């Protein structure tokens, strides 16, 4: 069994000091250097590596060491490497006309903000909710019905 990295959930001010753990994106470089591997060797063996992470957790190190011994003692089969195994790049037609050049990206706002906060994203997202009658769009004016109902009953 491949081990899964264990990272800390970011402790917010709202939390008040309550903390929990979660499956991180991948094993940090500091955790890998305590077992003798770099990112290329770890990904070749099949581990998920996160070079962005700086912290090191001993529980992550022990799980690496126990699993690495089984692999190097022929008692475990490693998974396929965590590297790209296919290269599919399609020919692009009408990049200028679909706003995919640098000027189009700047006009869409992808240079200055995230895709989720761009305006074209907000238009498409609210349209999908209204088309499917999703979470808050299943009722129009849900906030005002809720507000007046709270006054009348909690008077």
């Amino acid at each position: 069994m491949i081990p899964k990295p264990v990272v800390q959930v970011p402790r917010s001010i709202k939390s008040g000091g309550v903390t929990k753990w979660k499956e991180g994106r991948g094993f940090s470089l500091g955790e890998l250097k305590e077992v003798g591997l770099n990112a290329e060797q770890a990904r070749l063996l099949g581990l998920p590596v996160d070079t962005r992470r700086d912290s090191v957790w001993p529980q992550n190190v022990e799980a690496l060491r126990k699993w690495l011994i089984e692999v190097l003692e022929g008692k475990a089969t490693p998974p396929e490497p965590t590297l790209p195994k296919v290269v599919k790049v399609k020919r692009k037609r009408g990049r200028a006309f679909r706003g995919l050049t640098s000027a189009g990206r700047r006009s869409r706002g992808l240079i200055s903000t995230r895709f989720r906060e761009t305006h074209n994203y907000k238009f498409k997202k609210k349209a999908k909710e209204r088309r499917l009658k999703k979470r808050h769009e299943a009722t129009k004016g849900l906030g005002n019905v809720l507000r007046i109902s709270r006054i009348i009953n909690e008077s």
Partner: protein, 184 residues
């Protein structure tokens, strides 16, 4: 410090005064030439090379001239609420650079647009240089950058076999060199 660094100083503050004298004489011919014209070399070589220009067969640099200002917003001829009747100050969400790219794309049908950059401004016109590439040319298809626009494919057997072969040899080496340290 490459020569391209010194080339940019004509568009910096140190060389702006001399460059505007040059543009006042160069712009006379450009205003008389066609609106879209192919050029042998880019006007801003250092800027062009950053955006992906190379002097390879099939790469086209076109100079585009267009009128500045807001777009030709049309006054509605039917009933509208007062918010929707204004004209002055209303502009398009497209910039003139993207507009200049699209016009250059029309004149060279089938060529893909790579990038474009600003060149010069005058009282009426704005000038851009659009880099278009022929995706059907053999010298463009194999370019490390130009294959991002012209498409690229690698069989899964090629990547999967070598990655498998790398993992077999890495495990062989790690057993003899890393296993004693891990167990100890």
């Amino acid at each position: 410090p490459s020569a391209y660094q010194y080339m940019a100083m004509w568009y910096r503050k140190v060389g702006r005064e001399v460059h505007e004298r040059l543009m006042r004489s160069v712009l006379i011919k450009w205003r008389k030439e066609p609106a879209i014209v192919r050029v042998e070399r880019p006007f801003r070589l250092e800027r062009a090379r950053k955006l992906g220009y190379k002097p390879k067969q099939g790469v086209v640099v076109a100079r585009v001239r267009l009128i500045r200002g807001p777009f030709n917003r049309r006054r509605p001829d039917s009933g509208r609420r007062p918010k929707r009747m204004g004209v002055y100050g209303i502009t398009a969400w497209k910039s003139w650079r993207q507009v200049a790219e699209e016009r250059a794309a029309r004149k060279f049908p089938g060529l893909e647009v790579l990038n474009s950059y600003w060149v010069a401004d005058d009282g009426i016109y704005r000038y851009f240089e659009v880099i278009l590439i022929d995706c059907n040319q053999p010298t463009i298809q194999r370019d490390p950058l130009y294959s991002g626009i012209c498409g690229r494919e690698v069989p899964r057997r090629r990547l999967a076999r070598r990655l498998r072969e790398r993992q077999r040899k890495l495990i062989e080496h790690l057993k003899k060199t890393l296993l004693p340290k891990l167990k100890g």
